[PDB]
């Protein structure tokens, strides 16, 4: 039951109402329980190239399944929930660890205001002075302690999650104030110990293998049930402690982003109305993370590091059950942080809401009191049932992948990323936005295929499908679009450079975990997973329709070349 601060959100609700004053109404039968409701108003694709080249997966539901009533279903199940406040001692511990962590991350880095030029340069991955006049107007309100237009448009996706969109101008104001966390890699492994920001998916496995060698208990990788919805008002205040390291001007800009965008959010959501009509509801909420913000990932990484440090302190018996209610003496916490903090950070791989921890023993498994009091409840497990850890690092889930050690034909080991193949093909078959020419569709298909060549070459079906896609798209067409939104997708495949040369730069030359720098001169030297592992992770090798697809692949490529244009230049990546 939300108690809104009308002094902070009132201006935004009035600005929305002024835009839709003639259809605005108050629906006393609205469905919101934990969100404050303010009023309502009246409101109003498959990648063909990848589909044609992945026929066996037309009947695989794990693939095709990936492509207002639905949006309300997600809101009700996932977002319309309230977690009790942690106890005072739990909150004192949270603030202490956050303050200590912020000071560690800022020891060799300084907060800075990000510029309009940096933002414009990123948008090329804004030209109208009127856009910047609206931005200036909102910034002036922010510097006076007001907010008129930083409103979320929350779109639900029932597959399930909510994406909280914001206008480009509000995203710039957030980037200007807090973009330094991303732009200057505050969560990079070197700066944070436990973070992995800036590492590609190609390096994450080696991190987990390094952690497997640190003496201790099992490796724990518990997923929080709906992380963003479990970010409390107290996590938000602890995250805001970075403002204490900012110069006065910068500080004013950030305190306004934190107050209005993070801690007193105004959101517009769609809802079905009578006879096919749709209404827009204006709702507000003080806690939770607004999924989609410029620093969502960085602040999720920060708070997850804080939570894992607290769990280790409880496991190691630094914190006791008396400390939840009130932390009487805090010296023990400061001592553990100053003495062991860095060792424990280096024992973690934290990427937003995903974590892997290598505690000093298995007491970590039953250290749940502080974790549960902070509302960071583990997914698919009884609240008080001890966590299950892993003995084999190659089976540890992290960033929706697991990592396996394979060997090149010359004997050198490599550590590769892997996930269930259905998710990979399913995502490649999704085309965002409609009306694309065969150029945009084929260029996005080519991006997916070259991404698989660099990272998932060890999957039989993907190496074959990637080669058929690359043989069906003109060689000179530059890959375009976004294959992934993950910060671990560094885009080395977004090029017309030969992918075997790119593979060598990523896996050999620039790979600090590849001692011998001898180049790999042929794709047949690059291994696949064993057939057992390829099948476990969704391969269709040996399955009749896939066998027919592979036997007919040259005919399928020729058909795609015929559609695109037989006069274009193609290369045979299959032979
Ligand atoms: Zn604002
Ligand atoms: Zn796998």
From Swiss-Prot:
Binding positions (Zn(2+) 2): 402, 418, 537
UniProt topology in membrane: Peripheral membrane protein
Record-listed Zn(2+) 1 binding positions: 138, 142, 147, 150
Motif (Nuclear localization signal (NLS)): 107-113
Compartment(s) of residence: Host endoplasmic reticulum membrane; Host nucleus
Post-translational modification note: Phosphorylated on serines residues. This phosphorylation may trigger NS5 nuclear localization.
Residue ranges annotated for the RdRp catalytic domain, each copy included: 217-367
Catalytic activity of the protein: a 5'-end (5'-triphosphoguanosine)-ribonucleoside in mRNA + S-adenosyl-L-methionine = a 5'-end (N(7)-methyl 5'-triphosphoguanosine)-ribonucleoside in mRNA + S-adenosyl-L-homocysteine; a 5'-end (N(7)-methyl 5'-triphosphoguanosine)-ribonucleoside in mRNA + S-adenosyl-L-methionine = a 5'-end (N(7)-methyl 5'-triphosphoguanosine)-(2'-O-methyl-ribonucleoside) in mRNA + S-adenosyl-L-homocysteine + H(+)
Top-level taxon of the source organism: Viruses
Notes concerning its domains: Comprises a methyltransferase (MTase) in the N-terminal region and an RNA-dependent RNA polymerase in the C-terminal region.
Subunit structure of this chain's protein: Homodimer; dimerization may negatively regulate the GTase activity, a crucial step in the capping process. Interacts with host STAT2; this interaction inhibits the phosphorylation of the latter, and, when all viral proteins are present (polyprotein), targets STAT2 for degradation. Interacts with host TBK1 and IKBKE; these interactions lead to the inhibition of the host RIG-I signaling pathway. Interacts with host PAF1 complex; the interaction may prevent the recruitment of the host PAF1 complex to interferon-responsive genes, and thus reduces the immune response.
Role summary: Replicates the viral (+) and (-) RNA genome, and performs the capping of genomes in the cytoplasm. Once sufficient NS5 is expressed, binds to the cap-proximal structure and inhibits further translation of the viral genome. Besides its role in RNA genome replication, also prevents the establishment of a cellular antiviral state by blocking the interferon-alpha/beta (IFN-alpha/beta) signaling pathway.
Record-given protein name: RNA-directed RNA polymerase NS5
